[PDB]
Paper text:
Despite its original annotation as a “QOR,” ceQORH is inactive on quinones but preferentially reduces γ-ketols in the presence of NADPH. γ-ketols are long-chain reactive electrophile oxylipins and are potentially toxic. In the ceQORH structure, the internal chloroplast targeting sequence is folded as a two anti-parallel β-strands (Thr71 to Gly81 and Asp91 to Leu97) connected by a long loop (Ser82 to Gly90).
In the crystals of the binary and ternary complexes ceQORH-13-KOTE and ceQORH-NADP+-13-KOTE, the asymmetric unit contains 12 and 8 ceQORH molecules, respectively. The quality of the electron density map for 13-KOTE differs depending on the monomers in the binary and ternary complexes, suggesting flexibility of the 13-KOTE aliphatic chain. The 13-KOTE binding site is large and solvent accessible. The 13-KOTE carboxylate group from one monomer is hydrogen bonded to the Arg58 guanidinium group and Tyr14 hydroxyl group from another monomer. When the apo-ceQORH structure is compared either to the ceQORH-13-KOTE or ceQORH-NADP+-13-KOTE structure, the main chain from Asn46 to Leu61 and from Ile250 to Lys269, containing the α-helix Pro254-Met267 involved in the dimer interface, are shifted. 13-KOTE is not a substrate of ceQORH though it displays an unsaturated double bond in α,β of a carbonyl group. The tetramers observed in the crystals do not have any physiological significance.
Residue numbers in the entry: 4 to 329
Write the structure that this text describes.
Amino acid sequence: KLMHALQYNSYGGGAAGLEHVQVPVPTPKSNEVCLKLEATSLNPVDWKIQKGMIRPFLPRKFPCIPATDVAGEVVEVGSGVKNFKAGDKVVAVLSHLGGGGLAEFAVATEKLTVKRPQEVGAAEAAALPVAGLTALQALTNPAGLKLDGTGKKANILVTAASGGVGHYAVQLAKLANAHVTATCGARNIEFVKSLGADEVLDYKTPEGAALKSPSGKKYDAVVHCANGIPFSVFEPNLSENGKVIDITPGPNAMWTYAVKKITMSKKQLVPLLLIPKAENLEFMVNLVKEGKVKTVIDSKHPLSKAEDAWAKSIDGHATGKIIVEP
């Protein structure tokens, strides 16, 4: 019947603007499944939407229940659901239109729900969807690396590699047999080395502010997860046809993309929008199961204290992924 959740009913609230509320448990449609949530993961998008930065596209209507990355147990399925039964443990991606993550229950489409193996925890799994698939898409599509053994070997730069997409990106890039150069805060330099990065740079230094690799590497692709960097700084560090992949693209990135396209610049800036596909989520889940990829969890917060997790996300000093559990 009813359900604990967190809502914002207005732009600009910050964590203060979140409200604990009791709300009717959603009902699954033909193709949806209903989950008792075991873990929910935050993404920077989630608090940006609330700040109003994604207007006029999101949020669709107030009030909003935030977060899309989710793991839990199937409680109930819709008439059309073929592949999941009640009791099944899953990981899923909620619609970016309706949100729903910060709650006891959520409905997910079957096409974005994946069975979660016994080996993989709920928090470990819930951290995967947006961050992991983004990292995966960037390295698979624009960077053009296979992740078996048949991919192009290459030089990869990962900016802000201590964060959500960042720390997945480094691990994945290593599985594609790439040389990985990474940037992060001084504190996280040892951590990023442990993800498999070949070179790690303190971004406040001179070689890291300029993104110059000690081997003198030029990068074939950049999984760009940081924010304050103009194409100027990337350019001299790029290979002849290097692509900087902005996984959090603003108007600046969008414009640069247009200009570099229309002037046929050999060096390119690629805005990335994630297209979550269940095959990829299944894939990432397997990588975690097989130990080829580890999820690092910055912190775990109870839904009753979810604003803390929200504020931690807003500060964005998180290392890996922030998790909210019941």
